[PDB]
Design a protein around this motif. Structure first.
Motif, mmCIF file in Angstrom:
data_model
loop_
_atom_site.group_PDB
_atom_site.id
_atom_site.type_symbol
_atom_site.label_atom_id
_atom_site.label_comp_id
_atom_site.label_asym_id
_atom_site.label_seq_id
_atom_site.Cartn_x
_atom_site.Cartn_y
_atom_site.Cartn_z
ATOM 1 N N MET A 25 -21.090 16.283 -12.784
ATOM 2 C CA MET A 25 -20.590 17.627 -12.516
ATOM 3 C C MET A 25 -19.839 17.636 -11.194
ATOM 4 N N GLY A 62 -27.175 21.491 -16.149
ATOM 5 C CA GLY A 62 -26.037 22.097 -15.458
ATOM 6 C C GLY A 62 -26.364 23.319 -14.616
ATOM 7 N N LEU A 63 -27.276 24.154 -15.110
ATOM 8 C CA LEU A 63 -27.673 25.370 -14.407
ATOM 9 C C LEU A 63 -28.206 25.087 -13.006
ATOM 10 N N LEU A 64 -29.178 24.180 -12.908
ATOM 11 C CA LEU A 64 -29.763 23.803 -11.619
ATOM 12 C C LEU A 64 -28.820 22.986 -10.746
ATOM 13 N N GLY A 110 -25.520 23.162 -10.885
ATOM 14 C CA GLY A 110 -24.514 24.124 -10.453
ATOM 15 C C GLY A 110 -24.966 24.976 -9.285
ATOM 16 N N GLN A 150 -23.292 24.878 -5.580
ATOM 17 C CA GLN A 150 -22.868 26.123 -4.965
ATOM 18 C C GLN A 150 -23.493 26.308 -3.585
ATOM 19 N N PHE A 194 -21.822 27.918 -14.546
ATOM 20 C CA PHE A 194 -22.513 27.345 -13.384
ATOM 21 C C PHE A 194 -21.547 27.037 -12.233
ATOM 22 N N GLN A 254 -15.217 20.397 -13.321
ATOM 23 C CA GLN A 254 -15.137 19.265 -14.240
ATOM 24 C C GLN A 254 -16.546 18.779 -14.466
#
Ligand SMILES: [Cl-]
Ligand SMILES: [Cl-]
Ligand SMILES: [Cl-]
Ligand SMILES: [Cl-]
Ligand SMILES: [Cl-]
Ligand SMILES: [Cl-]
Ligand SMILES: [Cl-]
Ligand SMILES: [Cl-]
Ligand SMILES: [Cl-]
Lengths: 239, 240, 234
Positions: A37, A214-216, A218, A222, B163, B167
């Motif tokens: 990611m 992806g949630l965690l 992301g 951030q 999220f 990419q």
């Protein structure tokens, strides 16, 4: 499958250290299902701050202040907020580590050393910068102990030192994740419908998908992004 | 065999059968499938403008909101009808291309991750797709998500843009052939006919089973989705 | 499997798939990408392409210039031109570039031998010949053997970024993506340039980011120096 294509092909023997690094990389990729990611980050405030104070820093302390120290610190603080990323897969349980010990990559011409900055959250930017120049100094002289290499819970690699724009790294088994900090590049970007010129940096994260999604990932990315983008003359203390 | 603990105060969190199953699935997929990866940039400005023009009266009439994602699912489903090679399964002896376009969509709640399926998504309208998204996401937070909803998937789409990702490389939901990540829609300076324009750009990131597919098919497929998204306007697109 | 279609896998298609599987299992892949300014290359190619095809009979593509740039960089970095062999790394004396020329249904990977010793014209000629042999089912076994590095033209499929599987037992694969016009910053001014991503997968048993980065910088510098007066085709 032939491994030679000429009589003049050169054979280079592999020492015990190099073979152990290679075995580590193979184990990591075999045991961990990697996902990846990427997030774009405005590093202009960090660039401006660093360049303002770098010269008097080297006069007063005797070692240089790199961009990397700031990135280590921003990662360290984000890991306090997200312990799931400071973790290890262990069959039937996930172990969340109480220490934030950040492995950093410092490679030689031949091979790759990964020393550890212990309790990075509890160090100042000056302290991290001191430790970086010390560890790089010890890697250059070949005087790097096993206590320098152990206990890492998270890994950060400065791939921007090699001019890369995006990269995907192999997780340092048995850790959960690795962050690659890429090159800082001047880019035309859009801010409130206007075209601006900002110093952008990609942050590229590989994750153990058994532990994280992806949630965690992301939310963590951030958090690092916000920490970097808040850096200015008024908001950030070196000590 | 290496040490797994670094303090006495390290916290051990036990893994329930559900999360342990997801984790075993991720490992099986990575071991069984040689992943390769492709990415295209897509101008989603038409899609953004059209959605924002209609979203307010949609929620008033239907009772559920219309997201950007519904349009992408529709664009992907049509492209799967164009390229059934992507809607497939490796079987050692043969490759099975599935007639049914059933799209698994990733819906995550905190730490745990669900993948419910939208059956025959090529035959549904954007309205119908939006309805099923809000239904399945509603049941995912409630935990009232049945096994029949989880089964029958032939392709997976993940909304990684939720999220804040730009990419991503996802792990293919085995025994499927490919997974698409739809990234964040970001305003970017862009070159159109030697001029500088502000466009709503989105990356589409595809992992492929390289036993089944190469860059040629993957490129064609991604181009089809790109063309499907870029043609979206008031006159070209009907919701019903 | 109601209205489902079944496609049988012959011995050749099964061999490719097994090779892909073995590569991913044996090689721990890491990946790296740099952006390069291909404006000089684009301008030079376009200025000279028509008189080239008229005189030679075969076309000059962007790809020929990229092969040459990679081959020259491999002279400086033999560590990329290598193979993992248990207790030894084997650096190869020949720079033999495997290229992907997928014609029709499947993927063909023939090899341009000693690509460092060929001119851009020579490389363009060989690409034309190998594409013609792939189209006519005339590729010899020698044409498929001896590759030490792989370059893939994924830009032909409209790819902007890509991660490729390494052609085992090689150390690395380079993917050359699409050339896109982009707003770019040069000396604090906004310029429009022809930008191309070079995406590199490496065997992390052999190579790390430092070596991979230097290699990509060498290719970058080779491509960005291509101009109207600098490089000769012959
Ligand atoms: Cl993996
Ligand atoms: Cl790397
Ligand atoms: Cl995910
Ligand atoms: Cl894989
Ligand atoms: Cl992901
Ligand atoms: Cl390919
Ligand atoms: Cl791998
Ligand atoms: Cl590919
Ligand atoms: Cl590295």
């Amino acid at each position: 499958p032939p491994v030679r294509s000429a009589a003049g092909d050169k054979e280079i023997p592999i020492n015990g250290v190099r073979k152990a690094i290679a075995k580590h990389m193979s184990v990591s990729k075999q045991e961990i299902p990697h996902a990846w990611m990427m997030v774009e980050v405005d590093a202009t405030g960090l660039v401006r701050y660093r360049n303002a104070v770098k010269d008097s820093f080297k006069k007063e302390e005797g070692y240089s202040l790199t961009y990397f120290a700031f990135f280590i610190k921003a990662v360290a603080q984000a890991l306090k907020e997200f312990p799931q990323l400071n973790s290890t897969w262990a069959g039937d349980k996930i172990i969340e580590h109480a220490n934030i010990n950040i492995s950093i990559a410092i490679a030689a011409g031949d091979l790759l050393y990964v020393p550890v900055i212990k309790n990075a959250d509890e160090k100042s930017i000056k302290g991290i910068a001191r430790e970086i120049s010390e560890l790089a100094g010890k890697a250059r002289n070949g005087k790097l102990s096993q206590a320098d290499m152990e206990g890492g819970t998270f890994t950060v690699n400065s791939t921007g030192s090699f001019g890369s724009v995006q990269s995907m790294g192999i997780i340092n088994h048995p850790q959960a994740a690795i962050l690659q900090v890429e090159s800082i590049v001047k880019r035309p970007v859009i801010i409130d419908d206007m075209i601006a010129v900002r110093d952008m940096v990609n942050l590229c994260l590989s994750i153990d998908h058994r532990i994280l999604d992806g949630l965690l990932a992301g939310k963590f990315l951030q958090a690092i992004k916000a920490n970097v983008e808040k850096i200015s003359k008024e908001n950030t203390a070196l000590y």
